[PDB]
Structures are given as structure tokens and as C-alpha cells.
Design a protein around this motif. Structure first.
Motif: not given
Lengths: 193, 197
Positions: A155-177
Motif C-alpha cells: 500500500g505504498s501506492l494504492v489503486r484509485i478508481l478500481p473499476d477503471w483501467s487502460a485496455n490491457p495490451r499484450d507483449i510480443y516477441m517478433l522475428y523474421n523468416h
């Protein structure tokens, strides 16, 4: 044994380094050249061996994680002001904003979005210094939940507006053929981590 | 305008600037700050900025320059790395060790007590454009790095990182505060900085 990679600029230390340290420790004969990158859309895929980015066509893409930005404040900020009860009340609070999360596009459990483009009390091109200002109690910020789990936990930082968020984004690894053995050992290691 | 626009050096902002900046914002909640961490301050246009904090001097006659601090880069490695290899005893032995290099210290220019200068241009086991991730790999015992002392002083005191080649060091670089020779909000900021130091 040089591998040249690009990684998300804010998330690299907390999220990629344990994986990368593990890999280097297992394969001492492999050099890594890392570039933290704020926006991977401007990269030339032919220039890199592997690209790690947040958010999603000749490249192999494989999701390796996800991150959800959240709004937070320190306990002394919370204790000095009525905290916002709906997402509109952010306009009455001190905001702290870091690139790339400068234009807040917040979202609730029913898909509606509230856009906040108020000028922050503090704006920076890096999120780590914005977290520092938030921890000091200078206002509310929008921050990746993984960068601040250590503070959320006690609780050094606390969540405010718990019903709200940014849209979760996925993290990707990309590479070539063919594909050099150094690169595939690394890709495979990432997939198994 | 509704903000003070400041530039600060890339790797040092969190450690050397933010305490002062957080204290200022604390004292002047009505004042807004926009902050940009910056790698090459010789490429900035002074008129584009209210205040500029930079490593190393500038010769601009239109700017007042005040030294607010200094940093010195030193060689370190974790105890696990040290207890796994015979440590180097002259700066030329760096070639036979795993090196970790972060911008703007991809080039290691090392002086000793007697004045000898050794330049290391070897590619690291790990190279990065930021020093924080380099430190992380050092802590995990992957090799020797060169690092601004202010960023690792708690590591040195605790013993989690060790100084290697203690007779060797880079030359110190100073940190300056630059500003044009003025809006009140900018003036209040500059006086806070001077009165802080």
C-alpha cells in the motif's frame, strides 16, 4: 555470438532483464546488443534479430505476456483530498503523466472510454521518474501494474478508481523468416521462460 | 506558459534530479513541469528550453552555467563474479573479462594514480543504450561494468557490488544548470535549485 534485440522502453528492466540475464548466464559465448525503444512501429524488421513490443506481417509474432495500466496514488495524497469516485473527477486532481501514457484513454468494465488530456502537474518522457513523483504524493498517475507491484503489495501506492483501467495490451516477441542457431536458442529460451 | 520545460541527463535524472524536483513541486503545487531526459545536450536549442541540466560544460555566451554536482565512473562487479574469476590487476586485463557496457559509457577511458591512460573498446558480453539495465546484469554476476558512482553507491556500501581496479577511474564529469540571460515560474525554479544546493 552477437544477438541484436529491441525491447519496450519502459518495461525492459522489470520485465525483460530477468529473462535476458538468465539467457546470458546459460550461454556465456553469446553477445547481446540491446536497444530500449519507445515505439517499435518505426523499426526496420530486417535490422534486428528479435523485437519485443507491447501491442500487436512478414514477422513471426508470439505473445509472451501482458500488462494492464492502472491509476494509483500514494497514501498521503489519498489522505489530503477526496479521491475521485467516477472517472470524470480526475479533472479536479493533480495528474502525473509519462510517455507513452500521456493521453490517458481509460476504460471501465462495460467498454466505455473516458479520455483525459489534462496537462499533468508533472509530465516526463519516462515513466520511472513519474512513479517517483507519484510515490512522493504529488498526485494520481497511470502506470503499468507490473512496474509497481512491490508498492501495491504494502500500500505504498494504492489503486484509485478500481473499476477503471487502460485496455490491457499484450507483449510480443517478433522475428523474421534458415535462421542462425544463436537466434533460435534465444527464441526457444524466451518461449520456455 | 502553463509549464516549465526542462531537460536533464539520461541516466542520472532519477538519482540526482528527482529529489530536488519533487521538493520543488511540493512547494509550488500551482507550477507544472514538463521533463525530458536527454542524451546529447549539445544538440539542444537553448531557446526551446526553460532550464537545461547537462553533463559536461557548454560555451554558449547566451547561457548562465552553474555547476550543481559531479559524478565519477568506476569499475564494479558482483562478489559472485569476483569469486569465480581471478580479478584483473591492470586495466589492460579487461580484455580477458566479460564486460557490460551502457551508453554513454560504451567507451571506457581509464586513468590511474600515476597518470597512465587505457582505452577499452571491446564489445561487451552485454551492451545497452541505458545504464540501469547494465547494472542489473552486473548484479547478476555476468561481468565487469563501468558505472557512474552515484548510481551504485548503496550497492558499494552494502557490498552487493565490489569495486575492481580501485587505482583506476574515469575522469569526473560535472553537471551544470543552464538558462538564458525570465518568467516568474522559471525564476522561482532556478532559485529553489540554487537554495537547494
Amino acid at each position: 555470438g552477437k544477438i541484436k534485440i529491441s525491447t519496450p522502453y519502459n518495461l525492459t528492466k522489470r520485465m525483460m532483464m530477468p529473462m535476458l540475464n538468465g539467457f546470458m548466464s546459460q550461454y556465456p559465448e553469446i553477445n547481446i546488443e540491446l536497444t530500449t525503444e519507445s515505439n517499435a512501429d518505426q523499426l526496420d524488421p530486417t535490422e534486428w534479430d528479435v523485437i519485443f513490443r507491447v501491442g500487436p506481417s512478414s514477422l513471426i509474432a508470439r505473445k509472451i505476456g501482458s500488462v494492464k495500466d492502472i491509476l494509483v496514488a500514494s497514501p498521503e495524497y489519498v489522505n489530503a483530498h477526496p479521491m475521485p469516485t467516477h472517472a470524470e473527477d480526475l479533472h479536479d486532481h493533480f495528474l502525473l503523466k509519462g510517455h507513452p501514457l500521456l493521453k490517458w484513454t481509460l476504460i471501465n468494465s462495460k467498454g466505455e472510454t473516458v479520455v483525459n488530456v489534462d496537462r499533468g502537474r508533472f509530465q516526463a518522457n519516462a515513466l520511472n521518474v513519474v512513479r517517483s513523483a507519484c510515490s512522493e504524493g504529488l498526485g494520481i498517475t497511470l502506470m503499468p501494474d507490473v512496474m509497481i507491484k512491490e508498492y501495491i503489495a504494502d500500500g505504498s501506492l494504492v489503486r484509485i478508481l478500481p473499476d477503471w483501467s487502460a485496455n490491457p495490451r499484450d507483449i510480443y516477441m517478433l522475428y523474421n523468416h534458415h535462421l542462425p542457431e544463436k537466434v533460435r536458442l534465444f527464441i526457444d529460451y524466451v518461449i520456455a521462460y
